[PDB]
């Protein structure tokens, strides 16, 4: 009886909130973002009997990453030379070589342009792929750049070769990060192996669709995550563990040519072509792909107990979703993937190698916006890149009769990063509390 208030200081307890986060840079980074801030030595401490909940669909920093990536791109591109004077009437028929149909923008086109002195005009020419050209009304020999009817076009600075450098985040003073480590977690619900860290591990700002690549891999068996408010989900994420390797190549040898716009800025394009002409392609080990699809199918049925399962290729929309889109080196790609999803199922390593044929177009739009078409400078010579994949993005039609179906999508750039930050939830510590005791001043 007769207990009295004791006021402890700095007791461990937290509540949810949202706050800005520091972004760390690698110790040997590119060289505001190039070489700072510093790189720490991370550590992870495991705990006992810690009770906590997570929600991968609500957590904060997913939104923040969207701002950071766009801010970085804006900083990188802002000072580079605009291409506005280049946008003028093109005159082309372009059948000067035995290979004209596949590209149709050939050397020997012509468009009046300003020379290095401001009151004289000159005639030039260069290559273009028809996927970046459109035809004006009437005379079928006149052409215009696709995005110039609506926006200005900016050119990547030739000395800039930005690539996916990993980034990891550190909470500011007063906040703490919780991680969870149970290997069967669905992405929403309680955890029983809570943990705390100095900072998150590496994350790469990779841009792709129909599947995410160069990313990390799972720790256990394949997992499937989704929202659970209603079956009519937007995007279902499937996370792989077994890495299926992939290769892609571009055999032709591109020749770099240039023009100068005054006062002091140069413009690049594609000129002569060397070697025999072929379409770009990729390869896959059908063994591994079919085995992975088998496992996915036999895991996917858990939410759909008894219906048949069948895949079909994507449908409609701009090329950013009809195909697989990814970039290697300094140029982009688009790859039709009908063959890799025409399968089916029902209830109850180089053999058979598959190939797929792709295309490359220069002019690009940041997947979301209008008004900011990026222009890529062509890369001379041949290009090839090994790569591997770790997950797929699936959306579903209207389930009918005794069958259910999935198809590949994922055009919203948000989801990609949603697939690599399901772990962390950021909270704030409340270092003050109260309790009763019996101690006496004894003054």
């Amino acid at each position: 009886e007769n207990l009295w208030v004791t006021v402890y200081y700095g007791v461990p307890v937290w509540k949810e909130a949202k706050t800005t986060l520091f972004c760390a840079s690698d110790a040997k980074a590119y060289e505001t973002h190039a070489c700072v801030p510093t790189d720490p030595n991370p550590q992870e401490m495991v705990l006992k009997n810690v009770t906590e909940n997570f929600n991968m669909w609500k957590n904060d920093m997913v939104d923040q990453m969207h701002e950071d990536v766009i801010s970085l791109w804006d900083q990188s591109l802002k000072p580079c030379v605009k291409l506005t004077p280049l946008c003028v009437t093109l005159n082309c028929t372009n059948a000067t070589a035995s290979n004209s149909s596949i590209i149709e923008g050939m050397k020997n086109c012509s468009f009046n342009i300003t020379t290095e002195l401001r009151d004289k005009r000159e005639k030039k020419n260069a290559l273009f792929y028809k996927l970046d050209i459109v035809q004006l009304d009437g005379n079928s020999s006149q052409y215009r750049l696709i995005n110039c009817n609506t926006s200005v076009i900016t050119q990547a600075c030739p000395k800039v070769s930005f690539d996916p450098i990993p980034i990891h985040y550190c909470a500011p003073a007063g906040y703490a990060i919780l991680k969870c480590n149970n290997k069967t977690f669905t992405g929403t619900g309680p955890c029983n192996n809570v943990s705390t860290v100095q900072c998150t591990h590496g994350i790469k700002p990779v841009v792709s669709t129909q599947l995410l690549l160069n990313g990390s891999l799972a720790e256990g068996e394949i997992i499937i995550r989704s929202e659970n408010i209603t079956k009519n989900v937007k995007t279902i994420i499937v996370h792989l563990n077994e890495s299926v390797k992939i290769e892609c190549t571009r055999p032709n040898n591109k020749t770099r040519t240039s023009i100068r716009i005054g006062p002091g800025q140069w413009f690049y394009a594609t000129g002569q072509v060397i070697g025999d002409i072929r379409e770009a392609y990729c390869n896959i080990n059908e063994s591994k792909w079919n085995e992975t699809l088998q496992r996915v199918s036999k895991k996917l049925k858990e939410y759909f107990p008894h219906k048949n399962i069948t895949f079909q290729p994507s449908s409609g929309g701009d090329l950013e979703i009809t195909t697989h889109s990814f970039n290697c080196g300094g140029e982009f790609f688009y790859c039709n993937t009908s063959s890799l999803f025409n399968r089916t199922y029902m209830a109850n390593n180089s053999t058979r190698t598959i190939t797929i044929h792709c295309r490359i177009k220069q002019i690009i739009n940041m997947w979301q916006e209008v008004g900011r078409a990026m222009y890529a400078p062509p890369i001379a010579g041949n290009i090839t890149c090994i790569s591997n994949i770790t997950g797929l993005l699936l959306t579903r039609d209207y389930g009918k009769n005794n069958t259910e179906t999935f198809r590949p999508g994922g055009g919203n750039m948000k989801d990609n990063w949603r697939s690599e930050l399901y772990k962390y939830k950021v909270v704030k510590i409340e270092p003050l509390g109260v309790a009763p005791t019996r101690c006496k001043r004894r003054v």
Partner: antibody
Amino acid sequence: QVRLAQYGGGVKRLGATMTLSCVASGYTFNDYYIHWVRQAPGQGFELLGYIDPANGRPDYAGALRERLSFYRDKSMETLYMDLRSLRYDDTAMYYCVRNVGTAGSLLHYDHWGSGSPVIVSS
Amino acid sequence: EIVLTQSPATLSASPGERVTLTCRASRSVRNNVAWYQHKGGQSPRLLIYDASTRAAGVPARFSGSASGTEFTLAISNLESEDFTVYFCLQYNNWWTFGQGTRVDIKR
């Protein structure tokens, strides 16, 4: 404050292709879906399919995947619907509707539009 | 798949009365339901979504609740301009609609 207005429609001849259209207003064009719903006279509604403006994905109803068509342009905030081989039984009203949505689920319809009829006769 | 059975096809009332609508479902759809307003040659509008929460600009006399496999809508104090057709809607599996019930003059 936000509106969805329609143009086109009117009478059409049997067995002919037909068009409709909806024009967005300044709320935001990239942050919401769009649906097309119709109503035969003296009948319960039904749904056709939903088109996202962001990338252009369609997803048709199960009963009409051979005959419908969607596409959009973000530049002028416009959406076009193509319907082919009008049967006699398609005579009805058509609406556009916005559709609130979170990052991972779809909920309901909250702002219907102008309403446009179509009549088929030889 | 999902079907909503709307009954009765008509309700009779007079101004100042309290009228209750009802909507039945083929199978459970959680709390995912909403009620809509529709008038002669006009643009329908939102009344209630999530079966409990009212939206902005709505009159304060609307109310309703869920019943597991049934849904209830009620007008606390009927006004003259409230005489119209209403229909229930669900959004759990794939979109569908009811047939529509009309308010009627009591006699």
